[PDB]
Structure formats: structure tokens, C-alpha cells
């Protein structure tokens, strides 16, 4: 049922935070990185994925 539906399904079941990822979640992070508030951050890859990236083996 399409690649994206698998990823979203997997992300909502195995990520540390089991919540729906909204485009505005990335939006608020973008907004912060674009402001002077983050003057000391540069050349970084910030993960905004409910933490899925830290998992290795899934629970179920």
C-alpha cells in the first residue's frame, strides 16, 4: 500500500514518541534554526522524526 504508508505506519508504532508527525513540527524547528536564537548552530543535521532514528531493533 505504497512506500510512504509503510514508513508512516512504522514510525508511529516504533518511534520513541508515538504521535503523528505534522509538517508544522518540522516547521517550528525550521523557524527556530532560521532565527537568531540559534546563532551558535551551523553545519548540523538536526533530526525531527519523533526520535525514530535512535532505534535499532523494533519492539514487536
Amino acid at each position: 500500500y505504497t512506500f510512504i504508508d509503510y514508513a508512516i505506519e512504522y514510525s508511529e508504532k516504533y518511534a520513541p514518541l508515538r504521535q503523528k508527525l505534522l509538517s508544522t513540527d518540522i516547521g517550528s524547528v525550521a523557524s527556530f534554526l532560521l532565527s537568531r536564537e540559534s546563532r551558535a548552530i551551523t553545519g548540523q543535521t538536526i533530526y525531527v522524526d519523533n526520535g525514530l532514528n535512535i532505534m535499532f531493533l523494533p519492539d514487536d
Binding site: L21, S23, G27, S31, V48, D49
Partner: protein, 229 residues
């Protein structure tokens, strides 16, 4: 007066829109860079109020779009437009849609900006696995999805103020293998993330400008639906 150019918007279902919505929440003027092939269809949907609800900022505010310009990240300058695209129905009634032209276009109409967002990707062969992706497809993916960031910076840095900031979107596929994310997208995202570091050095030392990239999770956007796997 913060001005932010968001390159890579064709609708309200992607991240670019989520980014614009959150920015205007903080009163920053937004300029959209729309890919020519879907520019008129976008303006049409915009004019008939199809995005009206999508523009209501939680706090009862209305999202203020300064301007919407046709923009194609695969063309650095005017003399880069080939006759095939030069005659295409979608690009005919449009002009000044190259990275350099829109940079000048924006500078001329609104002056210097201090925020830039790269939120676009393109891979003709995303449906084929890396092994069967062709050289033409692979390079097309890097050109449109990776190099486009470098060209944006090179040309836009001239119309940006010191201490400006730039971001782009990437996917973890560049670091760990995700079957289905083919056609060189993974390669392009890997180049994007590395280029971000290198560009951070140059833009940081020469202009005091920052650049970072966000590795987002899955979002059922229009382009996402495309990836059939």
C-alpha cells in the same frame, strides 16, 4: 522585517507549507518559489480560495504571502535554459525563473532577505533501486536535489544580510538503507548533508551566515505518494 524565500512549494501538503505556516506565525514575510510546471495550477487554486483555511494561523492570524514566483532549481542562469524547456507550454508564458533571475527579481522588489529555505527534491528514477538507476537519472537527482542548494547559496548570498540563516530538508536514508528510496535520492541526500557542512564553513567564514539541514520523519505529501514501493 524578516523576509524568507521558500523554494519548493507546489501545494499545502508538504513541509514547505508547514514551514511557511510556522514562520508567518512569527511575522516573517514569505516568498514562495514555485516550480513552473505547477505554477499556474497553484495560482488558480490560490485565487479560488482553495488554500484559505490552510492559511489561517492558529492565533486567528492570516498567513501573509509577500509574493509567489515561478522558480526552477535546475537552471542557474538565463543562458542555461535549453530549447526543449524554452518552448514547453508550461515555461512559455513565464520568464525570470532561474536561480539568478529570481534572486535579482526578489532583490529588486523587496531588497535583502535574511532567511532562505530549500525544500525541494527530484529524482526521475526514484522507483528503481540504486543498482539499476542510470547515470542520467542519478545525475538528474543530484543536480535538482543537491547542487540546487549550492547554487541557491551562491546567488542568494548577494541579497542576504549578515547573520542570515539557511536550511534544507533531508532524510535518514542517506545514513541507513531504506529500500524503496531509490534512483539516487539517498545519494543526493548524502551529498546534501555533507555539502551543508562544507557550505557552513564557507558561508560562515566569509559572510557570517549559517546553514543547517533538517532530517525529517515521514509525511504523506504529494511527492511522497509518488514513491511507489
Amino acid at each position: 522585517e524578516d523576509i524568507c524565500f521558500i523554494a519548493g512549494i507546489g501545494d499545502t501538503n508538504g513541509y514547505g507549507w508547514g514551514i511557511a505556516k510556522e514562520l508567518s506565525k512569527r511575522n516573517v514575510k514569505i516568498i514562495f518559489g514555485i516550480w513552473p510546471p505547477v505554477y499556474n495550477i497553484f495560482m488558480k487554486n490560490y485565487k479560488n480560495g482553495k488554500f484559505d483555511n490552510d492559511m489561517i494561523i492558529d492565533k486567528d492570524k492570516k498567513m501573509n504571502i509577500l509574493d509567489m514566483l515561478p522558480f526552477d532549481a535546475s537552471f542557474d542562469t538565463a543562458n542555461d535554459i535549453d530549447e526543449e524547456t524554452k518552448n514547453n507550454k508550461r515555461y512559455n508564458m513565464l520568464q525570470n525563473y532561474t536561480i539568478e533571475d529570481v534572486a535579482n527579481l526578489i532583490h529588486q522588489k523587496y531588497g535583502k532577505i535574511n532567511m532562505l529555505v530549500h525544500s525541494l527534491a527530484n529524482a526521475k528514477e526514484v522507483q528503481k533501486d540504486l543498482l539499476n538507476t542510470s547515470r542520467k537519472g542519478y545525475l538528474d537527482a543530484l543536480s535538482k536535489s543537491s547542487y540546487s542548494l549550492i547554487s541557491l547559496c551562491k546567488y542568494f548570498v548577494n541579497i542576504m544580510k549578515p547573520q542570515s540563516s539557511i536550511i534544507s530538508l533531508t532524510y535518514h536514508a542517506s545514513q541507513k538503507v531504506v529500500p524503496g528510496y531509490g534512483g539516487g535520492m539517498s545519494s543526493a541526500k548524502a551529498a546534501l548533508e555533507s555539502d551543508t557542512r562544507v557550505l557552513a564553513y564557507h558561508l560562515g567564514r566569509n559572510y557570517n551566515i549559517r546553514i543547517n539541514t533538517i532530517s525529517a520523519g515521514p509525511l504523506k505529501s504529494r511527492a511522497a505518494t509518488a514513491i511507489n514501493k
